[PDB]
Structures are given as structure tokens and as C-alpha cells.
């Protein structure tokens, strides 16, 4: 079972509906994990969102029908969350994760003058499982302000103004030239040079922060050697992550290397390729062993059900982000290698029954791979 016929593989060229596109940027939405394959029913409440904007741009003020968990892959972002009585600005860098609670009004700036901003947001809708909506305050040539949803009368009395003034100042649909083109607009260094001022960054101490942004590489990867690096922040360590019962991981795999076969005890992992190419082999039980395989590339998404063993083989320098749903107390069990090899953790005698070989034949074999987590392919 491979490509297309593989329910866990989500080739990017045919798995994304774009919510909005412009010459200034683009927001894409991965299709529903369960509409795709009913086998991923417990991921019905989640959605993957890809975001990218050009230098000097800003995603206009809006709020969504869902709770988001942002992650910066590359570039710098300036996230400002506007509440009803004040405001909070965060300067995000690659590796940064920040939580935007459901229904929170915000805008996002890419302050880099010669570079793009690339992100991956995890959406968790509140009203209808798996589906949400963006409400934009602004009125652009691309979409109406949601305030246009109330009648002139209410707007007039609500704002204590004649509708002519309300329309002129906030909507301006009578002269599109005074309107912005879409939800993502370009800026001049001048403008940007202003918004950036006043903004909190992440730092060693925020890994434990209740509301500030935290970086995945603020600590030593849990696994690291000549072939790859595996960084991960768990619910136990971060309060935002604990609220969602999710873990985050960023892992690098060198060209020609593979992340040993292994499985997660309880976490359903959503993995998306950020860069590179790789071959992933997943194992299910039709007790006939079922082989699910695919060739992954940039922007592809692949999900690994809990307890399903898998392997990532890098055909070029690779890097992927990973969301561990139902992460609480998860245990990663490697099937090969020295460290965390659940296999070679069984009692000699039991190993003898489990396999044709024997006490020594088994262990002798399980001792041939001297490396751990990442090995050379």
C-alpha cells in the first residue's frame, strides 16, 4: 500500500485547499484527516495549516473559530494578540512555538526585508469538529469586514455615528482604491520598523512559561549523534502544551541516514516535512502485518497512529516538525540500537521463545547495531 492508496500519506500538491492567496503570501489548509481515511477518526478535531508571506508583510487583524498552536519554520515573525483591554506582542524565531487561544483577535508581521516567513499552525476548532472560520475585521477588496454583517441601523447606533462616516472610515467598498487588496499586505521598512518595537522573545526560561513563546532547541535534543538530531518538548515541561496534551518535536536527519524503526506508546503523531526528501515505512496489522509506505517531500504530511512502528530514511538533508497528539506520558520504543531498544529489554528466556533463535543468537544480533536512534544508511 503506497502513495494515494496510503491513507496516512498526504502529498502536498493534492491535500491542501488554499484559504487565501496573494502575491504577498498564502494560507493553506490540509484536508480533514478523517474525511480522507476514516481510520484517523481521533484526529477529526485537528487541522494542519501552512502559512507563508513575503518580506515586509502583515496578515491583517482577525480571529478564528479555533485554537491555534503556531510554529516558525523559517524567517522571523511578530505576533500581536489583541485582547479587549490590552495587547501582547511576541517576536518569534525559527523553532518558536506559541499558542493563540480560540477566538483571540490578532495580526502577524514578517519584519524581514529580504526573506520570507514560513509557519505551520495546528488548528483545533471549537464549534464543529475539524472545521473553523476566520473573521477578518478589516474590509479589503478580497473580503468584507464582519461588521458589515450588522445592519446600517445597528452600526449607526452601535457606533453613534451616521453610516456614511462608518462606511467611509472602516469599509470603503464604494472606492476600492482606498481598500487594501487582501488579508496580507505589503509594507515599507518605515512602517515595519515601528510594529516590531515592544515584543517579548523566547529564552531558556520560557520553556516553562505559561503564556510566552518557547523554543524547541532551548535544550539539548533528547537524541543526538553524527547522523541526526531529535528535539522535543512535552506536556510535562510546557504549560501551553499541557493544556492541549500535545508534544512538539523538530528533528534533523542527514542525507543518507535514517531514524531507527520505533513506535510511540500512546501518541498519534502528525509529521510534516519542512525540508528535504525521505522514505517512510509504517507498519499496521490488517494478524497480517500491513506495510504502508511513501516518498515524502517538502510540505507533505504523514500521520503515524499510536503504537504503529515506523522509520524515516533521509534521501537528502531532512527536517520535519511533529505534533504528538495525546502526548501525556508517551514512551518512545526503539526496535534497533543500544539505547531504548525495547526489544533487547526482554528476558533472555522470553527472547528464546519469541524467536526461532536462542538466548545468544538473539542478543548477538541485537548487539550488532552499536549506534542509537540515528544510524548510517
Amino acid at each position: 500500500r503506497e502513495d494515494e492508496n496510503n491513507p496516512f500519506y498526504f502529498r502536498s500538491s493534492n491535500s491542501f485547499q488554499t484559504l487565501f492567496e496573494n502575491q504577498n503570501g498564502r494560507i493553506r489548509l490540509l484536508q480533514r484527516f478523517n474525511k480522507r481515511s476514516p481510520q484517523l477518526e481521533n484526529l477529526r478535531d485537528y487541522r494542519i495549516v501552512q502559512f507563508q508571506s513575503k518580506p515586509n508583510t502583515i496578515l491583517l487583524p482577525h480571529h478564528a473559530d479555533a485554537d491555534f498552536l503556531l510554529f516558525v519554520l523559517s524567517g522571523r515573525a511578530i505576533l500581536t494578540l489583541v485582547n479587549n483591554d490590552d495587547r501582547d506582542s511576541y517576536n518569534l524565531h525559527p523553532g518558536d512555538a506559541q499558542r493563540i487561544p480560540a477566538g483571540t483577535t490578532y495580526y502577524l508581521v514578517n519584519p524581514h526585508d529580504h526573506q520570507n516567513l514560513k509557519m505551520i499552525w495546528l488548528a483545533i476548532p471549537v464549534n464543529k469538529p475539524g472545521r473553523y472560520d476566520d473573521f477578518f475585521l478589516s474590509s479589503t477588496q478580497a473580503q468584507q469586514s464582519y461588521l458589515q454583517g450588522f445592519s446600517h441601523n445597528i452600526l449607526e447606533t452601535s457606533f453613534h455615528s451616521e453610516f456614511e462616516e462608518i462606511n467611509r472610515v472602516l469599509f470603503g467598498e464604494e472606492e476600492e482604491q482606498r481598500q487594501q487588496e487582501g488579508v496580507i499586505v505589503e509594507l515599507s521598512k518605515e512602517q515595519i520598523r515601528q510594529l516590531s518595537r515592544r515584543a517579548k522573545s523566547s529564552s531558556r526560561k520560557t520553556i516553562s512559561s505559561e503564556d510566552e513563546p518557547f523554543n524547541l532547541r532551548s535544550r539539548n535534543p533528547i537524541y543526538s549523534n553524527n547522523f541526526g538530531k531529535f528535539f522535543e518538548i512535552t506536556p510535562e515541561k510546557n504549560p501551553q502544551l499541557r493544556d492541549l496534551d500535545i508534544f512538539l518535536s523538530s528533528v534533523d536527519i542527514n542525507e543518507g541516514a535514517l531514524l531507527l524503526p520505533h513506535f510511540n506508546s500512546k501518541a498519534i503523531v502528525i509529521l510534516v516535512i519542512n525540508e528535504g526528501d525521505a522514505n517512510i515505512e509504517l507498519v499496521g496489522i490488517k494478524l497480517e502485518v500491513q506495510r504502508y509506505r511513501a516518498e515524502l517531500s517538502e510540505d507533505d504530511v504523514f500521520v503515524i497512529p499510536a503504537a504503529y512502528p515506523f522509520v524515516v530514511n533521509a534521501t537528502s538533508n531532512l527536517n520535519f516538525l511533529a505534533f504528538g497528539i495525546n502526548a501525556e506520558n508517551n514512551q518512545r520504543n526503539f526496535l534497533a540500537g543500544e539505547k531504548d531498544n525495547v526489544v533487547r529489554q526482554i528476558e533472555r528466556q522470553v527472547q528464546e521463545l519469541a524467536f526461532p533463535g536462542s538466548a545468544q543468537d538473539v542478543e548477538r544480533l541485537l548487539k550488532k547495531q552499536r549506534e542509537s536512534y540515528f544510524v548510517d544508511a
Copy 2:
């Protein structure tokens, strides 16, 4: 999307199914939220029940496979929860709320001699999402005791008696809501505990929403609300309760709840509601509301309430924990005003001065003179 084609509008005249009814009172169950419209799939575990009783009446003893959050719209009530090893009676007044764990045997008295008892109970069924059953102990005519569910042999071995005795004494009044004398009523109202400022955080006793200052208040309206952070019962249901008053010819400014799904039910008066959804195409949903009418405001959808006559509504806020209420006009809690000047310039066709001048014209907050 006008009232009828509006999936979030529930006109009482055609949205409730009567469970029981006689000259003494009426219990109504509102149609399932999601089977009305798939857009409210996340309310499937919830159901609204309306309870009306005449002066000097009693809802006979019974339990249900559903958690119940009671709320007294008007009138007075004596609620007594009968546990397996004791009994607790409660004197409920208007604005009082109380959680009734699922499967708790109880009976409800209307102690007044001239005023009706009106209540709205939020039900959260335990066995099947959105559907539950009432198990009445009494053996009236409108229904048999669920005790008659066991065969004669069992009933006899159980109570240690001849079936004729058990049958004549327990299995043999009319309906589940019967009338009674004023003397019988005083005999049942003497031990009822009332709510009080030191019960707001009670884990099992009734708390009054209005026994505290409202969060928003002025010449045109009063907005009362108790959250999960303040009350442990609400925290268990992750719900917030709000009671708001609006003077005729006034409205509750456009605003949206960040994460709460609101179940709005009209107590008295009338009002026009405008809810706005998306699909980016803006969808308009409006309606004219009256007593007993229900309307749900999905989380994050902006809405406005325009009272056509002295109004008061009750609202259950689902997924209440940390909900943030954002207004779009008015001085206080106006999220639009928190947007940086530069971004207001970008986001709107007008300048920064234009937006700020416009955003400051409405000098009041929350409620304004329509």
C-alpha cells in the same frame, strides 16, 4: 437567513416536545441542537428543558440519566434532593441555579399561592448523548412506577410482603405534577436552605447569579455572570451562567465570545438578534425573539441584541473556561481600540485618526440607547 431559515433560531411555538402536561404544570424538552442543524454538532450532549408549575404544586419524586443545571427564571421553588442516606431541601429564588448530579432522586415544589414557577434546566444526558429518560417513582395514572419494572416474585422477596400489599400500597393520583394544600406546603418548606453570598462557591448548594454586582451596568442594562473560576459546580460542567437585562429601546453592543458557545433563552420581553457568521463571505442570521425562545451564538461569532421591550434573557455558556468577551464599539472592552494605530491604518480604508475618531464617538459601554 431570517427567523425560520436561521439554524440558530428556536421559536418555542415549534421547537419543543412536551414531556408531560396537565392543569398543574408543563415540562418541555427542546429539540436536539444538532439534528436541527449540523453546524451545532458540539452541543449534541446538551438539551434545554423548560419547567412551568402552578402555585401550590409538586413535581413527584423521580431521577433521570442526565446531569441537570437548574435555573429559576421567576417564581419561588423548594427543591429537595433525596440521597441514599439523607435528604436536603433548598429554597430557590429567581436567579438561583443549582447542579443536580445525574441519577439523583428529587421532587420540586412551587410554594406560592399566586405566582407561577418558571425554570430552565440544562440537561447533559449520561447514557446517550442528548437523550435521557425520567424514572418516576410514583404510581400515578399518567405513568407507572419504574418499580413495576420488576416481576411480582422479585418485588415480594425484595420488600418482604405479599404482592397484594405492595400493589395496593405502591402501584394501586393524576400526572407527575399534582396539587396540594397550603398546610402540606408549609410542612415541606420549613427546612429549605436558601442561597447567600457565602454559597457562590458552594460545591453542592444553590448560588444566585444576581446576588453579586453585574460585570457591566448602566442606565440601559445590567449584565450578570458567574464563571467556572468562581463556582465549583460550573467548573465541573465547564459552563458560565449569565443573566442580562436590557431596557426597551436599548441594545447589547456587537461583540463575540472567544471560546464559549452560548445557549441564549428569552425570559421576558422581546428583542431582535443579529448574528454574523462566515462563508470570505459574510453570512447574516437574524430573528425576532419572544418568551421561551432559544438562540445559540456559536463561539467567536459576533452578535448584537436589540430589546424591543423591557428584556431579560438567560444564557448558558458552554466551553466557558477562560472565555473572553470582546466588544466592537463602546469605550470599555472594545477590542478594535486595542489594535495599534499603524495597523488600524493598514486594516481600514480610513487613516489612523479616522478610525480613532470614529471609535471614540460612542462614549458609553456594553449597553447603549437604541
Copy 3:
């Protein structure tokens, strides 16, 4: 019978997962596909496990959280983690939880006397449906490791496929012929008389159970006696008959019409009582059933006859004379004729 959506008879209700000379593993049918009235039990599945003396279930794991309970016999449950390990000596009555996706193997270190167990399953990837992953390699199944190609297997193991295949790939079946677990009856029961005993461990008492919001109860009913009519306030109970047999009458609510659900239960039988649904258990021989309390936190047990926990006897006199046709006097006169509690003779 067979028309009582709450009755599950070990005969046409289960489905053998594995079966061989050394034991059997049956997986109960889905509560919800069975009857739409048991939707809130869709995440749960019952598994009946049996193993003859001196046998062992080879290493494996499932994408499901388990709650084991020893109906009879002894077993040595060993959990193998990614860098540690710890075995538990299970005795009848002992309860133990196996976190989802944990690799483990179970043994029967006794002769003659077998291993009889019931497991509560809570699947992780898709409600009510899980899969077992066996590391071992036998004629019954391939090791899941065979899911990886030769090249990949060669690299991971740093060895020519020739050997990983000779030492790991190619016995008979999955049952070859060879925090801390808590015992239910290790403490005094809650109800105790001459006709039976009622043992129960609630979530508020055990942290493992608190995790699952589940209570465990083991009750005994001397033949002739019966568990007095009663209903759990909020818990949905799944009872399984261990020894003996008995009759059960469960009353539901269709004017409101009383619905009746009754059945004759035997060994390995399973029956579910919806929360708040009144019922009675009548032992037609020495009886002992196991019960899983779902949605357990703060559950209240209300009896309808007897001296203790009699919710009916807790209703105010006036209201009683109002609820029933008899007088306030003839009602208490009646309600007081049973000096027994929980269990009474028949």
C-alpha cells in the same frame, strides 16, 4: 433474552482473537454497534483471556489501554519498557493497568490451575477498535518487524538480512507452552451479610482507577439470595459473570412506558446496566460477578428496598402519601418490613 440489547452471552457475543492448545483470547462485540443505546460505551471493549498451566503469551503490545483483572489463578505479568522492566505477581482479585502501547508478556507459573482473566480495553486510534502487535515470529503470525523492507532491516540491525531472518523470523501460537497492581478483596467490602458480600474500589481511592474514571466491584450472592433492586446514579456498569449463574431484571423507560429487560446469565456472560437504570441480580446458584464502573467519579448507589441506602425511605412522609396510592402510614408500614440490606434471601 437475545432481544435484550444489554445481554451479551459468551456463545454468540464474542469473537475468538486467537485460539490454541494453551489458551484462548476472545474480544467482546462492540457495545454500540450492538445497541445504539450504549453509545457512551463505544470507546470500551471487553476481552476474555484464558491460559492453561505453565504457558505464556509472547511479547507484543496494542494501541489500546488495558485494565486487567484476575478472575482466577495466578499470573506473572511483566512490563518491558524502553530501558527498564518490572514484573508483577498477579493473584485472583488483583487489578492492574497496562498503559497503551506498552510491550508485555504474561505467564502462568502454576500447574493444573489455570489463568482466567477479563480485560477492559480502551483503543487509542479509532474508538472501539484496536490491534495487537506481536514481536515474536510464528506460524500463526509474522513479526511486525517484517513490515520493514530488507534494506531497512539490514541497516537498522547492521546485519545481512540472511541473519535477522534466521534468528527472528522463519513456534505455534501466541500462547506457547513454556502504579502497583492492587487487589480488590484485599480490603473489607462495603456491604456484608449472610447472603453475599459487595467489594468495590472507587476512583477517589485508587490513582490508577482515577486515571480512567472507573470503579471496580466484585460481588458474591449466595444461591437463593439476590442483590436488592437499586441503580447507580451516574456510573454505567458492565458486569461479567465469573462463577455460577443468576437472573437479572433491568428496568428502562420507553404516556411513559416502563420497559423490562431480563436474562439468564452463566459463566463468561456479560451484561450492561445503563447509568440510573434500576436493576436486580438474583442468584440461581453460587454467584460471583465482576463489574466495571464507567463514568465513576462520585457515583451514588441507591437501593429501593431494605434498611440501608434506601433512597425511597428517605422521601418525606407527605410526599410519599402523595407519590403512592396508599397512606403515609401504610407506606412506611410496608417500607419497614424488610430488615435486611443489599442482600436478602429468597
